[PDB]
Design a protein around this ligand. Structure first.
Ligand SMILES: Nc1nc2c(ncn2[C@@H]2O[C@H](COP(=O)(O)OP(=O)(O)O)[C@@H](O)[C@H]2O)c(=O)[nH]1
Ligand SMILES: [Ca+2]
Lengths: 237, 165
């Protein structure tokens, strides 16, 4: 416990730099995972019980460090604003058909729930809690596609459906500070946990940010003149 | 012990989603650790003999998502580039995925070329030898697969596991 508070105080005495900060934080978490493993208190117990301790430590550490490391330079804030501005125009006119997804009552009610789960990301400081919002949103989408596969006679689209639904959900959610939220998770979620399904879900939203940020007429199946008209309509609010 | 990120790449209709479905469905009988999702699966395969846990990433094949691919194959232990043997253009698209991965993927990535829908005998347009020659020249291996009949499906994943470091 002593390690942690004196880690945090003297950590916060280093001059802030996102790369050194996250390098130092990830090494600290990684050393602590090794120590939990070796501590009389965690003998014989499962990886669930060990990850649980790791997660407690992450949240404790990251709650103190949050204001120092989250959205704390101009480059990050400028990209946050730029991405928000863009989604706030595009969400006014993008349709499901633009991304080849079917707006049935069933689909829509899940998309709306996925959107609501994603919108909670700004209620939390901890990388894990922020991430869970993304995983919960992706799980809702995952389960929609799973049930569609039992209910139907054509072969499941897989990622061909999964990604555009996520792109649509993210555009509709337009969570404030998405760019900085994603970088923060990438930097500060302990590396040993950003693997497997969680990494597949997380990379998917990362790739959605990239697509959304790069949206033009062609990428959303619109011709130039219509897209310009829509963006113009959106700009007038 | 051994976790291995494997990315599925190939154009629309080649068989990405079908291939991994066939793989995981047939492996059910082995009663190993597994995760079934719509676009991600994990599957532990006994290959003689240690644990390989495949973390299998399905990708959206539409050409508008192409520029996102690097985000997926980042850190990948392995890639299967799928094409439809009955479609010349799909094979051409597969060649570009290979070139791209050679240029931008981890040096250690194990690459496999899957000539899928090998079961469509009358319709085949790409030959084994033209696909095998291409595999030889670019340091990967080629295997004809059929998600439909299961032909070589287990065998492609097994063969990659054997080539892992
Ligand atoms: N005959 C045959 N059909 C296949 C095979 N693999 C996939 N298909 C069918 O080809 C179509 C395209 O497959 P799909 O998995 O959805 O391709 P994807 O776009 O790469 O994800 C689907 O209707 C499959 O049912 C195969 O090995 N043989
Ligand atoms: Ca698919």
């Amino acid at each position: 416990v002593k390690s942690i508070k004196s880690f945090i105080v003297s950590f916060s005495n280093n001059a802030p730099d996102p790369e050194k900060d996250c390098a130092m934080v990830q090494e600290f978490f990684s050393k602590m995972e090794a120590a939990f493993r070796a501590h009389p208190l965690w003998s014989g117990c499962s990886e669930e019980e060990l990850d649980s301790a790791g997660d407690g430590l992450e949240k404790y550490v990251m709650t103190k460090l949050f204001t120092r490391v989250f959205a704390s330079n101009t480059e990050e804030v400028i990209a946050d604003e730029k991405l928000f501005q863009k989604m706030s125009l595009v969400q006014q006119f993008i349709s499901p058909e633009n991304l080849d997804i079917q707006p049935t009552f069933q689909n829509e009610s899940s998309w709306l729930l996925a959107q609501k789960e994603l919108q909670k990301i700004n209620m939390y400081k901890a990388p894990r809690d922020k991430l869970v919002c993304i995983l919960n949103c992706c799980k809702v989408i995952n389960n929609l596609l799973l049930n569609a596969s039992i209910a139907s006679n054509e072969n499941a689209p897989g990622a061909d459906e999964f990604l555009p639904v996520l792109i649509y959900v993210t555009i509709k959610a337009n969570p404030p500070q998405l760019h900085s939220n994603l970088l923060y998770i990438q930097r500060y979620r302990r590396e040993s946990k950003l693997v497997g399904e969680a990494a597949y879900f997380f990379t998917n939203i990362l790739s959605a940010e990239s697509f959304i940020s790069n949206i033009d007429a062609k990428s959303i199946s619109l011709d130039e003149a219509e897209f310009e008209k829509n963006m113009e309509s959106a700009r007038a609010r | 012990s051994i976790n291995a990120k494997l990315v599925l790449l190939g154009d629309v209709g080649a068989g990405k989603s079908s291939l991994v479905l066939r793989f995981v469905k047939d492996q059910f009988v082995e009663f190993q650790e597994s995760t079934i999702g719509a676009a991600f699966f994990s599957q532990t395969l006994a290959v003689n003999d240690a644990t390989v846990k495949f973390e299998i990433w399905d990708t959206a094949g539409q050409e508008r998502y192409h520029s996102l691919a690097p985000m997926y194959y980042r850190g990948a232990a392995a890639a299967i580039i799928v094409f439809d043997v009955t479609n010349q253009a799909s094979f051409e698209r597969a060649k570009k995925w290979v070139q791209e991965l050679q240029a931008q993927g981890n040096p250690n990535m194990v690459m496999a070329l899957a000539g899928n829908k090998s079961d469509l005998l009358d319709a085949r347009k790409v030959t084994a030898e033209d696909a095998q020659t291409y595999a030889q020249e670019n340091g990967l291996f080629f295997m004809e697969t059929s998600a439909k009949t299961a032909t070589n499906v287990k065998e492609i994943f097994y063969e990659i596991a054997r080539r892992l470091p």
